[PDB]
Enzyme design. Structure first.
Site, PDB file in Angstrom:
ATOM      1  N   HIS A  53      -1.938  37.700  -4.097  1.00 33.89           N
ATOM      2  CA  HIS A  53      -3.053  37.269  -3.270  1.00 33.89           C
ATOM      3  C   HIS A  53      -4.032  36.552  -4.186  1.00 33.89           C
ATOM      4  O   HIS A  53      -4.312  37.045  -5.280  1.00 33.89           O
ATOM      5  CB  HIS A  53      -3.737  38.495  -2.659  1.00 33.89           C
ATOM      6  CG  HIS A  53      -2.839  39.326  -1.800  1.00 33.89           C
ATOM      7  ND1 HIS A  53      -2.648  39.069  -0.459  1.00 33.89           N
ATOM      8  CD2 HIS A  53      -1.987  40.329  -2.119  1.00 33.89           C
ATOM      9  CE1 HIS A  53      -1.800  39.958   0.033  1.00 33.89           C
ATOM     10  NE2 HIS A  53      -1.344  40.698  -0.964  1.00 33.89           N
ATOM     11  N   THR A  84      -1.738  45.594   3.373  1.00 38.47           N
ATOM     12  CA  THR A  84      -2.919  44.766   3.603  1.00 38.47           C
ATOM     13  C   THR A  84      -2.637  43.560   4.483  1.00 38.47           C
ATOM     14  O   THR A  84      -3.537  42.735   4.693  1.00 38.47           O
ATOM     15  CB  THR A  84      -3.512  44.255   2.297  1.00 38.47           C
ATOM     16  OG1 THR A  84      -2.578  43.377   1.663  1.00 38.47           O
ATOM     17  CG2 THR A  84      -3.854  45.429   1.385  1.00 38.47           C
ATOM     18  N   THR A  85      -1.415  43.419   4.956  1.00 34.20           N
ATOM     19  CA  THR A  85      -1.065  42.392   5.898  1.00 34.20           C
ATOM     20  C   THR A  85      -0.415  43.017   7.139  1.00 34.20           C
ATOM     21  O   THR A  85       0.041  44.109   7.091  1.00 34.20           O
ATOM     22  CB  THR A  85       0.014  41.445   5.362  1.00 34.20           C
ATOM     23  OG1 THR A  85       1.143  42.190   5.006  1.00 34.20           O
ATOM     24  CG2 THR A  85      -0.456  40.700   4.163  1.00 34.20           C
ATOM     25  N   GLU A 111      -7.828  41.579  -3.381  1.00 33.49           N
ATOM     26  CA  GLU A 111      -8.032  42.339  -2.155  1.00 33.49           C
ATOM     27  C   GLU A 111      -8.857  43.587  -2.445  1.00 33.49           C
ATOM     28  O   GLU A 111      -9.921  43.786  -1.848  1.00 33.49           O
ATOM     29  CB  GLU A 111      -6.684  42.684  -1.516  1.00 33.49           C
ATOM     30  CG  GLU A 111      -5.926  41.410  -1.141  1.00 33.49           C
ATOM     31  CD  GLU A 111      -4.844  41.635  -0.141  1.00 33.49           C
ATOM     32  OE1 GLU A 111      -3.918  42.456  -0.373  1.00 33.49           O
ATOM     33  OE2 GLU A 111      -4.954  40.980   0.918  1.00 33.49           O
ATOM     34  N   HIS A 116       4.445  40.095  -5.015  1.00 37.21           N
ATOM     35  CA  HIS A 116       3.818  38.893  -4.484  1.00 37.21           C
ATOM     36  C   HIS A 116       2.378  38.898  -4.958  1.00 37.21           C
ATOM     37  O   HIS A 116       1.931  39.864  -5.588  1.00 37.21           O
ATOM     38  CB  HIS A 116       3.827  38.834  -2.954  1.00 37.21           C
ATOM     39  CG  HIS A 116       3.117  39.983  -2.328  1.00 37.21           C
ATOM     40  ND1 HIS A 116       3.748  41.166  -2.019  1.00 37.21           N
ATOM     41  CD2 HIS A 116       1.802  40.182  -2.087  1.00 37.21           C
ATOM     42  CE1 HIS A 116       2.860  42.021  -1.544  1.00 37.21           C
ATOM     43  NE2 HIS A 116       1.667  41.453  -1.595  1.00 37.21           N
ATOM     44  N   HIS A 144       0.805  42.495  -6.394  1.00 41.19           N
ATOM     45  CA  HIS A 144       1.308  43.691  -5.725  1.00 41.19           C
ATOM     46  C   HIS A 144       2.792  43.826  -5.987  1.00 41.19           C
ATOM     47  O   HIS A 144       3.577  42.970  -5.568  1.00 41.19           O
ATOM     48  CB  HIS A 144       1.045  43.619  -4.220  1.00 41.19           C
ATOM     49  CG  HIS A 144      -0.402  43.707  -3.881  1.00 41.19           C
ATOM     50  ND1 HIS A 144      -0.918  43.282  -2.675  1.00 41.19           N
ATOM     51  CD2 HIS A 144      -1.440  44.217  -4.580  1.00 41.19           C
ATOM     52  CE1 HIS A 144      -2.216  43.527  -2.649  1.00 41.19           C
ATOM     53  NE2 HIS A 144      -2.560  44.081  -3.798  1.00 41.19           N
ATOM     54  N   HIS A 172       2.605  32.927   3.841  1.00 39.78           N
ATOM     55  CA  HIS A 172       1.307  33.532   3.584  1.00 39.78           C
ATOM     56  C   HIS A 172       1.131  33.755   2.093  1.00 39.78           C
ATOM     57  O   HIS A 172       0.013  33.723   1.575  1.00 39.78           O
ATOM     58  CB  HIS A 172       1.171  34.876   4.309  1.00 39.78           C
ATOM     59  CG  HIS A 172       1.648  34.860   5.733  1.00 39.78           C
ATOM     60  ND1 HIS A 172       0.853  34.437   6.777  1.00 39.78           N
ATOM     61  CD2 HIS A 172       2.821  35.254   6.288  1.00 39.78           C
ATOM     62  CE1 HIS A 172       1.521  34.554   7.911  1.00 39.78           C
ATOM     63  NE2 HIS A 172       2.717  35.051   7.644  1.00 39.78           N
TER      64      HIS A 172
HETATM   65  C1  LIG Z   1      -0.400  37.383   1.453  1.00 40.55           C
HETATM   66  C2  LIG Z   1       0.838  38.187   1.872  1.00 40.55           C
HETATM   67  C3  LIG Z   1       1.679  38.831   0.979  1.00 40.55           C
HETATM   68  C4  LIG Z   1       2.787  39.553   1.429  1.00 40.55           C
HETATM   69  C5  LIG Z   1       3.068  39.637   2.789  1.00 40.55           C
HETATM   70  N1  LIG Z   1       4.194  40.362   3.377  1.00 40.55           N
HETATM   71  C6  LIG Z   1       5.437  40.747   2.712  1.00 40.55           C
HETATM   72  O1  LIG Z   1       5.636  40.499   1.567  1.00 40.55           O
HETATM   73  N2  LIG Z   1       6.430  41.474   3.496  1.00 40.55           N
HETATM   74  C7  LIG Z   1       7.716  41.919   2.972  1.00 40.55           C
HETATM   75  C8  LIG Z   1       7.656  43.237   2.194  1.00 40.55           C
HETATM   76  S1  LIG Z   1       7.292  44.662   3.256  1.00 40.55           S
HETATM   77  O2  LIG Z   1       7.397  45.930   2.533  1.00 40.55           O
HETATM   78  O3  LIG Z   1       8.260  44.856   4.336  1.00 40.55           O
HETATM   79  N3  LIG Z   1       5.734  44.426   3.886  1.00 40.55           N
HETATM   80  C9  LIG Z   1       4.579  44.500   3.029  1.00 40.55           C
HETATM   81  C10 LIG Z   1       3.443  43.817   3.416  1.00 40.55           C
HETATM   82  C11 LIG Z   1       2.298  43.873   2.643  1.00 40.55           C
HETATM   83  C12 LIG Z   1       2.332  44.609   1.480  1.00 40.55           C
HETATM   84  S2  LIG Z   1       0.828  44.696   0.484  1.00 40.55           S
HETATM   85  N4  LIG Z   1       0.007  43.224   0.599  1.00 40.55           N
HETATM   86  O4  LIG Z   1       0.040  45.794   1.035  1.00 40.55           O
HETATM   87  O5  LIG Z   1       1.239  45.005  -0.889  1.00 40.55           O
HETATM   88  C13 LIG Z   1       3.458  45.314   1.091  1.00 40.55           C
HETATM   89  C14 LIG Z   1       4.600  45.253   1.868  1.00 40.55           C
HETATM   90  C15 LIG Z   1       2.207  39.013   3.669  1.00 40.55           C
HETATM   91  C16 LIG Z   1       1.114  38.290   3.215  1.00 40.55           C
HETATM   92 ZN   LIG Z   2      -0.098  42.284  -1.102  1.00 39.04          ZN
END
Ligand SMILES: Cc1ccc(NC(=O)NCCS(=O)(=O)Nc2ccc(S(N)(=O)=O)cc2)cc1
Ligand SMILES: [Zn+2]
Length: 257
Positions: free
Chosen positions: A93, A195-196, A103, A91, A116, A61
């Site tokens: 977006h 946000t995911t 976002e 990461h 983020h 993603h």
């Molecule tokens: C486009 C995109 C980008 C990242 C993801 N997921 C992950 O990176 N997961 C692993 C880290 S986590 O902490 O376990 N989960 C987590 C999820 C979202 C956010 S956010 N977007 O609110 O900052 C922060 C943390 C999915 C789709």
């Molecule tokens: Zn994010």
């Protein structure tokens, strides 16, 4: 499984993750005329001098850079936060076009991308436990606009062709995330969510006012990544952003006049 397409995108997520329609979902539009300056907010403390990056990964993603969070090496403190939050990963977006991809929005303005930096509250011991807490995570969000190149992003962009497809990773040590920051640490803050999926309502959002600028060549290399895995039909990894969600009973506070 979830994604950003017509058939599995944000309007579908509530079916597997009903908190998608919850009381503190992210992202939101930041209305700069309704956000209130809060003088009780402290300056942010971004202490990344000892950051230890580990790997860069295409997770299907987005792409993410992971850090060693087994110790207080790269921490976020101060601002609206109590206690110490360790950097786990960052990461992005981004959009298919420069006029979309962030976002959060600012007076409905969309940026080309959004960075983020994900941190978790050390009083909960591990990130999986932190995500079950209302104050478990702090995500530092930084807007990207297209203009001048960001030198501190170039090392990231140069490795993206080695992680083109879902599940690919590469060594990505000795990367300094301080090179991704704007000059100012003025910010807006509000309580929100991932946000995911799973969209857990565990995030103190800290969104910087000042965007960083990246070059058209840098963001074009984001857009050459793939959502699919190797040997599957190529779907370009673009528009991996959730749109703004209802603010409901929340107030966005500003650290600045
Ligand atoms: C486009 C995109 C980008 C990242 C993801 N997921 C992950 O990176 N997961 C692993 C880290 S986590 O902490 O376990 N989960 C987590 C999820 C979202 C956010 S956010 N977007 O609110 O900052 C922060 C943390 C999915 C789709
Ligand atoms: Zn994010």
């Amino acid at each position: 499984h979830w994604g950003y397409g017509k058939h599995n995108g944000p309007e579908h997520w509530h079916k597997d993750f009903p908190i998608a329609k919850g009381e503190r979902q992210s992202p939101v539009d930041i209305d700069t005329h309704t956000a209130k300056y809060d003088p009780s907010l402290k300056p942010l403390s971004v202490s990344y001098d000892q950051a230890t990056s580990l790997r860069i990964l295409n997770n299907g993603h987005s792409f993410q850079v992971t850090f060693d969070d087994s110790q207080d090496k790269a921490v976020l403190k101060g601002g609206p936060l109590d206690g110490t939050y360790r950097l786990l990963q960052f990461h992005f977006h981004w959009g298919s076009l420069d006029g979309q991809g962030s976002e959060h929005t600012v007076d409905k303005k969309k940026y080309a991308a959004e960075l983020h930096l994900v941190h978790w509250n050390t009083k909960y011991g591990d990130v999986g436990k932190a995500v079950q807490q209302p104050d478990g995570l702090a995500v530092l969000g930084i807007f990207l606009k297209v203009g001048s190149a960001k030198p501190g992003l170039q090392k990231v962009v140069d490795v993206l062709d080695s992680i083109k497809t879902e599940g690919k990773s590469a060594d990505f040590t000795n990367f300094d995330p301080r090179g991704l920051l704007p000059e100012s640490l003025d910010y807006w803050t509000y309580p929100g969510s991932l946000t995911t999926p799973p969209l857990a309502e565990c995030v103190t959002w800290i969104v910087l006012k000042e965007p960083i600028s990246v070059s058209s060549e840098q963001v074009l290399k984001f857009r050459k990544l793939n959502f699919n895995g190797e040997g599957e039909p190529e779907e370009l990894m673009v528009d991996n952003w959730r749109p703004a969600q209802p603010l409901k009973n929340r107030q966005i506070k500003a650290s600045f006049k």
